[PDB]
């Protein structure tokens, strides 16, 4: 499934973006994805956030969060926003944000969360923010993304990119909810090992990386619109 050489190179070969001021080859757009977590009542998992950008033909992971909880929606949005602001701060060449917020069962909450994220970001820094928009009932666009047939293409595309060296972490990777307990990349590797094609091995951060990387292509570029 996943190569040993590719897992090992992802760990020991990370990009030190801070070592250079020559940005010609970096993508200027930060893609992020999150899947805010509610389920019912019980103590379950958390919420995966990932932030990625292009470098030549590669994709670079700038940020990871795996967040566990008063307003769940504010805590969630704030932890996404805080990661994004640090990332923008570390990589000034980044001049646009494109954000997808999964709303699969609870789309009202994903609406509000999108709106809260755009709020913290814009309070802190001047940048254009775009959200993945999808049609709803009376055919009106709403700032959410829906997982569906996509997930298989995305998973299968990740596995193939990772195996061939296309997925890389940066050295200055931001993670306020992981870094104090683990190297975030070692944590993310534990999940990459748990990957199958398509019952209690968490997979939330890895899917978030799979999806941020996936919505990178131009096939999705019109879906992103001012929220």
Q: Which residues bind its own copies (CB under 8 A)?
A: 5, 8, 11-17, 19-20, 22, 25, 55-56, 168, 171, 183, 185-186
Kindly determine how many residues on this chain lie close enough to bind Mg ion according to the rule CB under 5 A: 5
Footprint on residues 143-182 left by Mg ion (CB under 5 A)? none
5 binds, among Mg ion, its own copies, none (CB under 5 to 8 A by kind): its own copies
Q: How far is CA 82 from the centre of its chain?
A: 13
Residue with Cβ nearer Mg ion (39 or 164): 39
Active site residue 204: yes
Q: Which does 160 bind (CB under 5 to 8 A by kind): its own copies, Mg ion, none?
A: none
Residue placing its CB nearer to Mg ion in the complex, 11 or 172: 11
Angle value at C-alpha 146, between 221 and 207, nearest 5 degrees? 85
Stretch that binds Mg ion, among 32-40, 85-93, 107-115, 193-201 (CB under 5 A): 32-40
35 assigned to active site: yes
CB of 162 to its own copies, least distance (A): 16
Q: Does the protein bind Mg ion through residue 16 (CB under 5 A)?
A: no
Of residues 29 and 77, the one with the C-beta less far from Mg ion: 77
Using an 8 Å Cβ cutoff, are 132 and 144 in contact? yes
**C-alpha angle 133-166-98 in degrees, rounded to nearest 5:** 20
Given 16, 19, 137, 199, the residue binding Mg ion (CB under 5 A): 19
Angle subtended by helix axes 150-163 and 4-12, to nearest 10: 80
Widest distance between CA atoms in the chain: 50
Nearer to Mg ion, 17 or 29 (CB): 17
Q: Which of 74, 67, 47 is nearest to 208 (CA)?
A: 47
With beta carbons less than 8 A apart as the criterion, state whether 33 and 43 touch: no
How far out from the chain centre does Cα 225 lie? 17
For Mg ion, the binding residues in 71-110 under the rule CB under 5 A are 104
Binds 104, which of its own copies, Mg ion, none (CB < 5 to 8 A, cut-off by type)? Answer: Mg ion
Among the options 102, 186, 190, 218, which is catalytic? 102
- Nearest-approach distance from CB 35 to Mg ion, in angstroms: 5
The span from the CA of 88 to the CA of 53, in Å, is: 11
218 carries an active-site annotation = no
- Helices 204-215 and 184-192, interaxial angle, to 10°? 90
User: Other C-beta atoms within 10 Å of 10: how many?
Assistant: 21
Paired tokens of 142: 């709403």
Q: Interface with Mg ion includes 41 (CB under 5 A)?
A: no
Catalytic annotation, residues: 35, 102, 204
């Amino acid at each position: 499934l996943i190569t040993d050489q590719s897992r090992e190179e992802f760990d020991i070969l990370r990009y030190s973006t801070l070592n250079t001021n020559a940005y010609d080859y970096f993508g200027k757009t930060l893609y992020v994805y999150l899947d805010p977590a509610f389920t019912t009542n019980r103590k379950a998992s958390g919420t995966g956030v990932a932030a990625v950008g292009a470098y030549r033909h590669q994709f670079l992971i700038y940020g990871l969060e795996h967040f566990f909880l008063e307003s769940s929606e504010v805590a969630i949005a704030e932890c996404a926003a805080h990661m994004i602001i640090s990332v923008l701060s570390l990589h000034p060449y980044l001049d646009e944000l494109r954000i997808a917020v999964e709303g699969n069962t609870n789309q009202a909450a994903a609406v509000r969360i999108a709106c809260l994220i755009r709020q913290s970001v814009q309070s802190s820094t001047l940048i254009r923010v775009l959200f993945y928009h999808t049609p709803d009932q009376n055919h009106i666009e709403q700032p959410f993304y829906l997982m569906g047939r996509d997930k298989a293409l995305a998973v299968e595309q990740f596995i193939s990119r990772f195996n061939s060296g296309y997925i890389k972490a940066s050295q200055e990777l931001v993670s306020y909810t992981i870094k104090l307990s683990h190297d975030p990349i070692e944590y993310l590797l534990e999940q990459i090992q748990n990957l199958h094609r398509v019952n209690r091995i968490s997979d939330d951060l890895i899917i978030a990386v799979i999806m941020a990387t996936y919505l990178c292509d131009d096939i999705h570029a019109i879906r992103f619109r001012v929220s």
